[PDB]
Design a protein around this ligand. Structure first.
Ligand SMILES: CC(=O)O[C@H]1CC(=O)OC(C)(C)[C@@H]2CC(=O)[C@]3(C)[C@H](CC[C@@]4(C)[C@H](c5ccoc5)OC(=O)[C@H]5O[C@]543)[C@@]12C
Ligand SMILES: CC(=O)O[C@H]1CC(=O)OC(C)(C)[C@@H]2CC(=O)[C@]3(C)[C@H](CC[C@@]4(C)[C@H](c5ccoc5)OC(=O)[C@H]5O[C@]543)[C@@]12C
Lengths: 288, 287
């Protein structure tokens, strides 16, 4: 059995997840929709590879049963490849606000100095976003099922995209809600994000989330399908950190030649004195 | 061959058609799109019948190669069934303006008194719209191809709807452009529309268009096998008159419980002193 502190810890994380993850996306509104020669050669070739890996069609089900479907242009060579970027920025921004609320509700996060709160969220927002997205990923259809919104991979050869491989591999672990939310906490409380000052405090917090996860698995996963599950999850978290870094770089290349990121995204990802001045939205959201 | 008069009359109609039928729908813009308790319940049950006979899906192909597609809901029970009415009011209004412009170009129509011009257009506008829609109808895919915009039947049992049976049958006749525009003229110059005063003058003009059509077919098509093509065309026109009456009743019932018609549609369909004063937009458009 788990200890009382471990049971209480899982209860609090799960309560926070339920309060701050709009899994039906009911309150995601007012978003944008696609309308109805030197080193620049190499910059465009890269950004074209970057966006082609991120290629999905979009579905919007009306309350009535009606369905709008958007298929992106099939090409790659001009401003047509950027047509979903405003929408993607709005969705991402909505998800990031839910993750910021997730952190704020957690006692262990609330008590950190506000500058470390900023640094941890800068370091983890994309990671916790993928973890939440994975819970609504349908691996059979290659579709993220977001309430009335659906994102469907265009189309083996897609497993070559580390982002997509992550989602398929994580889904195959068949994790419980408790295990997702402990992955979120472990990634959130990463002691070695840039700018974090209380390394030792955050590190001791992370270690207790990891011990709670390992213990949860031991009490609830007797089957041989789940041998080494704890260590697989920890490896997946290390992979998520690498995919995080590849995205930060990917986003900056796209932003350079085609601005699209929202102000909160620019703050989270470093797009241009002290930590609190340079992140006024994050600072405001944390004081609320 | 045709008489030189007949040849000139066909050329006038072809020129009017060329000037006023935006066959690619390039200038249909700014249209609306479906957003992202006694006798009254008996009115709703009839309007539900009226609307589900008028259900298509909507496709919009962007210039960049992207495609937006809209599927309408199942009837259920509520205002969801009205979701495409604003868009259709915009399509119809666009098509009606092109038909008013069509009529205006034609010497034989221009020479009629303004009140009969109004009456003939009120009587025939919907018919000429369907004749023009037929020319962009793809019978194999059940789709009206309107440039970058398509209306697709969803789906044998749809041949039960007179409107759809009309488009499939007319398409099967494989008419020439010249035969369609003569069909438009014969429908437009119908003497028996409500309010027409110069019945005999209009009847004689219609007969000259019918005679021109009959002779066109005699002279251009391989005599036998097209033996009764003219009469088949005339029977399609009769059927179009009845579809026009059914749709007017349909539109009026829908309008009553869910207003959607544009001002021009209100004038054309009688939706509320002299015929001019009750049709100020039509009057303006004709001068
Ligand atoms: C692979 C991809 O296309 O991802 C698409 C669809 C998809 O296949 O899977 C998931 C769910 C993983 C993926 C999650 C995700 O992270 C978002 C929401 C993303 C859309 C584009 C980006 C990457 C956006 C960006 C960055 C640069 O150009 C756009 O940057 C962001 O921070 C995030 O919005 C995302 C989404 C929906
Ligand atoms: C069967 C149907 O779904 O018809 C659809 C699609 C279709 O399959 O075929 C065509 C293309 C011929 C057909 C032509 C047509 O006439 C319009 C534009 C119509 C939509 C509804 C109506 C009838 C509208 C009305 C009246 C009452 O409620 C709306 O009134 C009007 O005057 C016209 O807009 C029309 C349209 C697009």
């Amino acid at each position: 059995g788990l200890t009382e502190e471990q049971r209480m810890m899982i209860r609090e994380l799960m309560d926070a997840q339920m309060k701050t993850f709009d899994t039906t996306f009911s309150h995601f509104k007012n978003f944008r929709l696609p309308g109805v020669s030197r080193e620049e050669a190499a910059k465009w070739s890269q950004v074209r590879k970057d966006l082609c890996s991120l290629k999905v069609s979009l579905q919007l089900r009306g309350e009535d049963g009606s369905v709008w479907n958007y298929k992106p242009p099939a090409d790659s060579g001009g401003k047509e490849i950027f047509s979903l970027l405003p929408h993607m920025a709005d969705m991402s921004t909505y998800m990031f606000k839910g993750i910021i609320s997730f952190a704020k509700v957690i006692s262990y996060f609330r008590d950190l100095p506000i500058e470390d709160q900023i640094s941890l969220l800068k370091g983890a927002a994309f990671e916790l976003c993928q973890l939440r997205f994975n819970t609504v990923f349908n691996a059979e259809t290659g579709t993220w099922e977001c309430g009335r919104l659906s994102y469907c991979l265009e189309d083996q050869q897609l497993l070559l995209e580390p982002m997509l491989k992550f989602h398929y591999m994580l889904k195959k672990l068949q994790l419980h809600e408790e295990e997702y939310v402990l992955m979120q906490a472990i990634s959130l409380f990463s002691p070695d994000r840039p700018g974090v000052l209380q390394h030792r405090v955050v590190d001791q917090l992370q270690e207790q989330f990891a011990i709670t996860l390992k213990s949860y698995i031991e009490c609830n996963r007797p089957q041989p399908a789940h041998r080494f599950l704890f260590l697989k999850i920890m490896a997946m978290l290390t992979e998520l950190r690498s995919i995080n870094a590849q995205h930060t770089q990917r986003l900056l290349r796209i932003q350079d030649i085609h601005p699209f990121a929202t102000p909160l995204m620019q703050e989270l990802f470093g797009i241009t004195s002290s930590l609190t001045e340079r992140h006024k939205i994050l600072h405001r959201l944390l004081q609320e």
